[PDB]
Design a protein around this ligand. Structure first.
Ligand code: 4H3
Ligand code: 4H3
Lengths: 237, 237
């Protein structure tokens, strides 16, 4: 229906089995709600040893991805995607991914994800081949595959059929009623669906306030939310 | 030497092949610098259908991880790790991972990573079994496996043997000298190792300032850095 096609450029395409063969995303793939298609720059080399790295100009500790195989893989992905495909490069220098950012990306019917390895890719390929640079967080990884899979999983949840407000989640409880002396909050046992809703929202507001206060600043709280938060803050003091 | 052992609790242990069988982390594992050991709550069930989910008290859209199999898997991981193992739960409600946070976690010789599925896990298990809750970013995923692998990859880079300052990376260039009309910056061709160092640092400062200005506020710049940044800002204006 609103299905999604995701092209991936990667030296290690088999890593993507982690999302394509397991769990909710695995189901999404099997049911054709999500299509993940991989191209490997190694398949685009022509030398005997299938070389996919190259030396950086200016010297330096490491290597970069070799331009020609990577550029050719990217072109092959663009042609198979047709028009409308947004090309994304995953790196710490990119725009920081958050949930709003995920929902923005979810609007695309087609994405191509370029996963760098070694010390990265040539700056000119970013200029000429990449539409947007994104980061999943301010940390450095050995390759862009985990960030690419992270982004795929997050956008997948917005595809209709895949699944069944600015605050941290409330605590959840399941059997048994008592666990190491710790009891389930009575309200959750009450059946009072409206007290339960309010308790959960209050918990979310309190947790957000204690753990991630800056998140509250980006929000225009409803009257009910303002009240429950104030309550929570009174009880805390 | 300073090798690292990481226990993982997960309903989909095969996802971890993505890091254990490929690239730098795959090499780390083969060379015994990194050991990743998985326990699956499904192996700890006793009912005919190996049930690993359970209904949340208070009602709600989804399911939680069933307490008994998950708790038993966790206990089995703790006993195999011995003393000193820090137990981490991956979730959006956790402390936000960044590079400083990665280096802190890298100090642990033993970690146990608990990967939630469905709508999460019982709050009491977090209280009684989890030492620290961490998030890899402010977005929601179908499971904690990708965040756990993300954390493993990031800390792996700090294990000696695995590989070969608050700013975004500089641009890098490799062959060819001209690509779609775009030339490599002459300084990188000069061989002048000191001009190259300065150009790279200046680029990093400029990129950080333009893309992620808030990152500069957490830094005490050196005199050289202050100068190069000011230069960059003058040229920009
Ligand atoms: N936070 C992220 O999204 C992220 C992306 C990539 C990454 N590392 C890869 C390897 C390659 C060389 O660093 C470069 O292209 C990017 N680390 C972190
Ligand atoms: N940003 C993160 O580290 C992160 C962690 C987990 C996650 N989802 C899993 C599934 C499960 C139910 O939501 C819960 O335990 C956590 N999403 C994001």
């Amino acid at each position: 229906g609103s299905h999604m096609w995701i092209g991936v450029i990667s030296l290690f395409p088999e890593m993507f089995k982690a999302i394509t063969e397991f769990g909710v995303t695995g189901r999404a793939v099997k049911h054709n709600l999500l299509k993940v298609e991989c191209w490997n720059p190694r398949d685009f080399t022509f030398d005997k040893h299938k070389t996919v790295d190259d030396r950086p100009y200016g010297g330096g500790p490491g290597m970069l991805m070799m331009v020609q195989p990577l550029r050719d893989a990217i072109h092959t992905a663009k042609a198979a995607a047709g028009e409308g495909a947004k090309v994304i490069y995953l790196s710490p220098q990119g725009r920081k991914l958050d949930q709003g950012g995920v929902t923005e990306l979810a609007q695309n019917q087609k994405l191509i994800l370029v996963c760098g390895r070694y010390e990265g890719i040539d700056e000119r390929l970013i200029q000429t081949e990449i539409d947007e640079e994104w980061s999943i967080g301010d940390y450095v990884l050995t390759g862009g595959e985990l960030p690419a899979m992270t982004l795929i999983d997050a956008v997948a949840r917005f595809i209709p059929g895949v699944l069944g407000d600015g605050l941290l989640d409330c605590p959840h409880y399941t059997r048994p009623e008592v666990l190491e002396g710790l009891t389930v909050p009575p309200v959750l046992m009450s059946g009072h669906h409206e007290e339960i809703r309010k308790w959960r929202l209050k918990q979310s507001l309190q947790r957000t306030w204690l753990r991630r206060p800056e998140l509250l600043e980006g929000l225009a709280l409803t009257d009910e939310q303002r009240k429950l938060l104030k309550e929570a803050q009174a009880e805390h003091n």
